[PDB]
Amino acid sequence: PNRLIVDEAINEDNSVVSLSQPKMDELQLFRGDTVLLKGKKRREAVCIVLSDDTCSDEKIRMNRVVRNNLRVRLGDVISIQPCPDVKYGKRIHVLPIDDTVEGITGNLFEVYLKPYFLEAYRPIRKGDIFLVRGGMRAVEFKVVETDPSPYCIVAPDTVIHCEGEPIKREDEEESLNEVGYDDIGGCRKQLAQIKEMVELPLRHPALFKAIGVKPPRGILLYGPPGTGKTLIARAVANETGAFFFLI
Amino acid sequence: PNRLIVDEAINEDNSVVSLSQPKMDELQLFRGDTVLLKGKKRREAVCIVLSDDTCSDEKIRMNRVVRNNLRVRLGDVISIQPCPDVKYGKRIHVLPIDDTVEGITGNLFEVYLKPYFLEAYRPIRKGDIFLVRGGMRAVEFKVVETDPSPYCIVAPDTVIHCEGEPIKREDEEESLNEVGYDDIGGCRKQLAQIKEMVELPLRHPALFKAIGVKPPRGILLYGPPGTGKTLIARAVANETGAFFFLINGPEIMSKLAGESESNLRKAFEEAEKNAPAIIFIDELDAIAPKREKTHGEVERRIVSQLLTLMDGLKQRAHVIVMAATNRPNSIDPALRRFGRFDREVDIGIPDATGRLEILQIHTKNMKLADDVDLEQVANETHGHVGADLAALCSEAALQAIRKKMDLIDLEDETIDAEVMNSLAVTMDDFRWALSQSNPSALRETVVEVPQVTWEDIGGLEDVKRELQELVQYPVEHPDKFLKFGMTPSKGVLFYGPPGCGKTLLAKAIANECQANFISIKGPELLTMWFGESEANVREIFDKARQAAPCVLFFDELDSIAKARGGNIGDGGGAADRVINQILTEMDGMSTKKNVFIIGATNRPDIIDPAILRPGRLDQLIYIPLPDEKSRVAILKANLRKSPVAKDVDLEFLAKMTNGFSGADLTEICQRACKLAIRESIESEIVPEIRRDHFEEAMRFARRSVSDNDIRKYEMFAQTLQ
Amino acid sequence: TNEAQMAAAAALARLEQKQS
Amino acid sequence: TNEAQMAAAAALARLEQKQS
Numbered sequence A: 001p002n003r004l005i006v007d008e009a010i011n012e013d014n015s016v017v018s019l020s021q022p023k024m025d026e027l028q029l030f031r032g033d034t035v036l037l038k039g040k041k042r043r044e045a046v047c048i049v050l051s052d053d054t055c056s057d058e059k060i061r062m063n064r065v066v067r068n069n070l071r072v073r074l075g076d077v078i079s080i081q082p083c084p085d086v087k088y089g090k091r092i093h094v095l096p097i098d099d100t101v102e103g104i105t106g107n108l109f110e111v112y113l114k115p116y117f118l119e120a121y122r123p124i125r126k127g128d129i130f131l132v133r134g135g136m137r138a139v140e141f142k143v144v145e146t147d148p149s150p151y152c153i154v155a156p157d158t159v160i161h162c163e164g165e166p167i168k169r170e171d172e173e174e175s176l177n178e179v180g181y182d183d184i185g186g187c188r189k190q191l192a193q194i195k196e197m198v199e200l201p202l203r204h205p206a207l208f209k210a211i212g213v214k215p216p217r218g219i220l221l222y223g224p225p226g227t228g229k230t231l232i233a234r235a236v237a238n239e240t241g242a243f244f245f246l247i
Numbered sequence B: 001p002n003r004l005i006v007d008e009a010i011n012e013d014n015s016v017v018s019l020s021q022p023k024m025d026e027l028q029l030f031r032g033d034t035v036l037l038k039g040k041k042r043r044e045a046v047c048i049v050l051s052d053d054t055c056s057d058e059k060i061r062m063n064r065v066v067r068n069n070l071r072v073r074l075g076d077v078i079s080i081q082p083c084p085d086v087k088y089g090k091r092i093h094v095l096p097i098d099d100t101v102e103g104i105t106g107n108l109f110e111v112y113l114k115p116y117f118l119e120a121y122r123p124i125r126k127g128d129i130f131l132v133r134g135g136m137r138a139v140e141f142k143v144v145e146t147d148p149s150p151y152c153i154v155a156p157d158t159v160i161h162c163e164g165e166p167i168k169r170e171d172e173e174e175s176l177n178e179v180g181y182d183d184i185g186g187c188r189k190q191l192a193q194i195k196e197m198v199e200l201p202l203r204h205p206a207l208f209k210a211i212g213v214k215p216p217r218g219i220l221l222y223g224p225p226g227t228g229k230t231l232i233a234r235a236v237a238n239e240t241g242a243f244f245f246l247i248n249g250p251e252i253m254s255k256l257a258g259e260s261e262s263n264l265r266k267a268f269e270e271a272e273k274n275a276p277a278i279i280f281i282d283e284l285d286a287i288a289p290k291r292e293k294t295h296g297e298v299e300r301r302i303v304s305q306l307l308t309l310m311d312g313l314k315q316r317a318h319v320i321v322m323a324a325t326n327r328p329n330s331i332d333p334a335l336r337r338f339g340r341f342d343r344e345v346d347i348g349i350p351d352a353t354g355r356l357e358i359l360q361i362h363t364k365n366m367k368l369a370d371d372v373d374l375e376q377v378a379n380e381t382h383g384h385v386g387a388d389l390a391a392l393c394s395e396a397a398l399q400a401i402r403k404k405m406d407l408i409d410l411e412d413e414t415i416d417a418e419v420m421n422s423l424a425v426t427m428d429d430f431r432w433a434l435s436q437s438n439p440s441a442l443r444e445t446v447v448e449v450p451q452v453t454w455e456d457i458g459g460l461e462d463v464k465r466e467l468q469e470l471v472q473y474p475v476e477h478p479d480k481f482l483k484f485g486m487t488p489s490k491g492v493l494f495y496g497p498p499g500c501g502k503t504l505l506a507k508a509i510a511n512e513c514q515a516n517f518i519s520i521k522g523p524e525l526l527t528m529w530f531g532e533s534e535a536n537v538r539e540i541f542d543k544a545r546q547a548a549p550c551v552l553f554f555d556e557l558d559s560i561a562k563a564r565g566g567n568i569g570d571g572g573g574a575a576d577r578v579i580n581q582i583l584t585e586m587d588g589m590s591t592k593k594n595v596f597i598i599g600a601t602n603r604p605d606i607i608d609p610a611i612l613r614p615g616r617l618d619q620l621i622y623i624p625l626p627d628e629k630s631r632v633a634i635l636k637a638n639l640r641k642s643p644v645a646k647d648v649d650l651e652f653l654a655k656m657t658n659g660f661s662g663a664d665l666t667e668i669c670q671r672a673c674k675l676a677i678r679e680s681i682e683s684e685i686v687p688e689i690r691r692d693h694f695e696e697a698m699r700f701a702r703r704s705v706s707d708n709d710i711r712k713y714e715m716f717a718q719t720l721q
Numbered sequence C, D: 001t002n003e004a005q006m007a008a009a010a011a012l013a014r015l016e017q018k019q020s
C-alpha cells in the first residue's frame, strides 16, 4: 500500500518531494504536509510534499539527496505515509564529511548551515545527508545528534551546533558530488533513449536471463567532442550501480 | 513397400504429417486417420495424416519434432502404416527437459501442457519429444509414463501429471531449439540450391568416392550482413549431421604471425578427422581480401595458406568449406578459380513475402494481440534484413514487457511463467520498434519479384499480349525458335508520353513470369555519368545474371541526353559514357541466362540509335495516352483499394479527362482521397469518398501531356512504320 | 475408428486455423 | 498540524521562487 515508483525530480530542493494531486487525496494529506518515505535497509526520510503539473500519478519525484538517504535508486519502489504530528526541535548537531571539506576553513555555520537551516522549516532526521552549495564548493553534511527523535522540523529558534572532527564517509554511501543524471543539461532526449536501453537489463538482470529476448549489448554514442558522451556513460553507471570500467 | 522419402513440412503441427491423396488410397487410410511411422534404431512415432495440394506423391512431409522422434533426417526413407485401433488414454506423465526449463518457474501444466493437450486429441507415444511455445520461451517435454501402451490419443478427460526432476538430455538427442531449415524465412530459392549441392555428398559419401564425378568442395555465400549467411551454414550442418567448424576473420586475424596460419591449418585438420564436415569461414574478406588491397606479410601469408588448404580438399574427402562475404569481388580472385570456391550463391535481401516469414519465425514464442498485423509490418520494413527484423521483434517484446513489469513489481531470480504467458504484444509496440529500428541495407539494390499484376494496368491489351510473346515464348517453347532458325529478341524499348504505364508493363511481365525485377532509374544513370563511374554498369548487368531469371528495366533512358542539353545538346554526339557500357554488356549477354532487358524513354528522338540495333533493344512498343475505355479501367485500378462511394461516376470522369495520362488520372484519385481525409479528420474535431470529392479534385487536375508532345511521339512512331 | 475420427477433426481444425 | 503548516508555507514559497 502507498508504494510508488521513484522518479527524477525537477525541484532540486532537498526538503521537497513532488506528488501528483490525485495521490494527495488517496493519502489524505494536504499540500505542503510532512510525510515519511520508507526505503531500504530499514531506513527512512522525512520531507514536504508539494504538487505540480508534471509528476506522473503513480510516481514520486525526489532528488539524489533523498534517494541516497533512502538507499534507493531510480526505478525502485518506496512507501509514502503522512506524519501530521511532526514538531520542530531546539538543538541540531551537524558535522561535515571528511571527504568534502578540504582546503577550506572558516565558520561553517555562517557560510553554509545558517542560510540552509534558518527559517527554512526543513524536516530533518538523524542520519540524514544533505548538500549545501556556496563559495564555489559543494559541501555535504551529516546530522548526528538532535534533542527530539527521530526527526523534527527546523524552527527559526533552533540552534545549530558543529563541533568535532569531520565524519569519515561510509563505504556504502556514495558522495553527492559524483556524476548523476542531474549533471547533464541538454540532450535530454538522448539520455532518456539510452536509459530505456540500459537500465532494464542492469537493474533487473533476472528478467533477461529468464526470457528469450536478448538485451542490447553495445551502444555507440557519437557527436563532437565535449558534448557529454562520457558524462552520460558515467551518469548511467552511477545511477544504476553497475560497475564502470573506463577504456 | 509403403516406404516414403522424408521431406520438409509446411504445417508445423507436431502431431500431423501430410500425405498426398494417392498415397491415402494405396495405404487404405482416410483423411485424418492415425498412422505409425517406422524410423531408425527400432523407433516409431504416431501422428495424424492430413491431405493437401502441395505434398509430392512419393514423399511424406513432417516437421523437425517428428523426425527427431524417429531419429531420421531429411532425405531418409521411413515406412507408413495405419493403426485404426488406437484408443484414448486416461493418464499421461510428462516432464520437462533440464536443458530447456531454466530461469523460469510456475505451473507448467496451466501454461504449456494444458493448451497443448486439452481437446487437441494428439496421438502420444511413450518416449516422444514435443515442443510447446509460449511466454517467449520454447520449452520441450518428454513423455515418460502412460497407462495405455505403447501409444494413445489424448481425450478431454485425460489427466496430465508432472512430478519429478527435469530429464537430462540424451547425448544422441539434439535439442529442438537448434538451428534448422524451419528457422530460415526468405531466400528459399538459395537454400534449395545449396541443399542440392551439399546434402548429397554429405549424406551419401559412398556415392562420390565410388564414381568419377567430383563433388563441390567450396561454396561462397554473399550478400549484406544480417541476411542469414551463417544461419544457412548452421542449418545445413545441423540438418545433415555434418560436423560444423566455425571460422571467422576476427578470430584468425587477432592472432600473431605464426599463430593465425597455424590455427587456420588446424581447422582443416579437425574437419577431416570428423568428416563429413563443413567449415564455415565468416567475414572472408577479413582473412583473404583482394590482393591489391593488402601488402602486409601476415595478410599475404594467410591468403597463400588458405589457398593451399582449399587445394588440399582433393585429399580431405567429404569436407566442404563454405564462406561468407559481402561482395564476390572483395576477396582474392584466386579463391574463386576452378576448385576452391568455384560455387557461389547470392543470398540477397528478403522481399516483402520473405520479411513476413522472418517476422513470423522470430515471433513463434511471442504472444501477439489480435491487432498485430505482421504482413503490414513486412510491407513497411523496406530495406531491412533478417537481422533487423529480429531486432525489431526483440524491441517490440521489450516495450510490451516494460509496460507490465513496472505494474506487477515482482522481483526474484526466476520469472513467473504465467506472467509472461499472459503478456500480449500489441501493434503499437511493433510500430514503436519500427520507429526505433534502423535498416542496415537501406541503400542496397532491391531485387525482387514485383507485386504488380496485369489487373493493375488499365488498357494496353495488345501490349500485354506482345510482351508475353517477347518474354515467355523463348523459354516456354524453345524448340520452335530452333526449328525456324529464329533469334529471340534480347529486349524492348518503351516510348511514349510520361505517366502511361511504361514501368508497370515491365513489372507486370516480370511478375507473371515470376522473375526478379531490377529497377534502374534516371538518377542512377545520371550519377554514373556525372561521377565518371560508368564502370558500375557492369555490376548492374552482372547482378541481372546473378538474379536470373530476371527483367532489367532501364527507366529514363534519355536522362543523360537531356542532361547534355536535350533539344539542342552539346558539342558531341548521341553516344555517352554510360550508354556505351550498357551496349557493351548487352552484346556480351546470352539469351541462355534468361535475362530480358527493357528500356523506357519519354524522348525517343534523342536515344542513341545504337541501342536499337539487332542484338540490343531492337523491339519498340508505343505506349499511347489511354483512350476512353482504358481511362475507365485506369480509374478503377487506381481506386481498387479506395472506399469509393457508389455515387462516383467513373465513366463520366473518363469522358471529361480526354487528354489526361494515367498519372494524371491518379492525381485525381489521390486528390479526391485527400479531400475525403480532410473532411473525415475535421468531423472528429467521411465513411466513403463522395462524388463531391472527385468533383472538387477536377477543379485542379490538368493534363500533363500537351498536343505538341503527342505529335512528337506520333511522328517517331510513323518513322518506325 | 471413433478415437481416430476425433483426432481427425482436431487436426483438420488446426490446419485450417494456420492456412487462414 | 501547525508545525507542518509552517513547513508547508516555506516549501511552497521556495518552489514559487525557483519556478518564476
Ligand SMILES: Nc1ncnc2c1ncn2[C@@H]1O[C@H](COP(=O)(O)OP(=O)(O)O)[C@@H](O)[C@H]1O
Pocket (backbone or CB within 6 Å): A183, A184, A185, A186, A187, A224, A225, A226, A227, A228, A229, A230, A231
Ligand atoms: N550536456 C552536458 N551537460 C552538462 N555538462 C556537460 C554536458 N556536455 C558536456 N559537459 C561537460 O563538459 C565536459 C565534457 O568532458 P567529457 O565528458 O570528458 O567529454 P569527452 O568524452 O569528449 O572527453 C565535462 O566537464 C562535462 O561536465
Ligand SMILES: Nc1ncnc2c1ncn2[C@@H]1O[C@H](COP(=O)(O)OP(=O)(O)O)[C@@H](O)[C@H]1O
Pocket (backbone or CB within 6 Å): B183, B184, B185, B186, B187, B224, B225, B226, B227, B228, B229, B230, B231, B282, B324, B350, B358, B361, B385, B386, B387, B388, B390
Ligand atoms: N532469412 C532469415 N530468416 C530468419 N532469420 C534470419 C534470416 N536472416 C537473418 N536472420 C537472423 O538474423 C541474424 C543473422 O545473424 P548471423 O547469421 O550471425 O549473420 P552474420 O553472418 O552477418 O553475422 C540471426 O539472428 C538470424 O536468426
Ligand SMILES: Nc1ncnc2c1ncn2[C@@H]1O[C@H](COP(=O)(O)OP(=O)(O)O)[C@@H](O)[C@H]1O
Pocket (backbone or CB within 6 Å): B456, B457, B458, B459, B460, B497, B498, B499, B500, B501, B502, B503, B504, B505, B600, B626, B633, B634, B637, B638, B661, B662, B663, B664, B666
Ligand atoms: N495504364 C495504366 N493503368 C493504371 N495506372 C496507370 C497507367 N498508366 C499510368 N498509371 C499511373 O501512373 C503512375 C505512373 O506510372 P509509371 O508507369 O510509373 O510512369 P513512368 O513509366 O512514366 O515512370 C502509376 O503509379 C500508375 O498509378
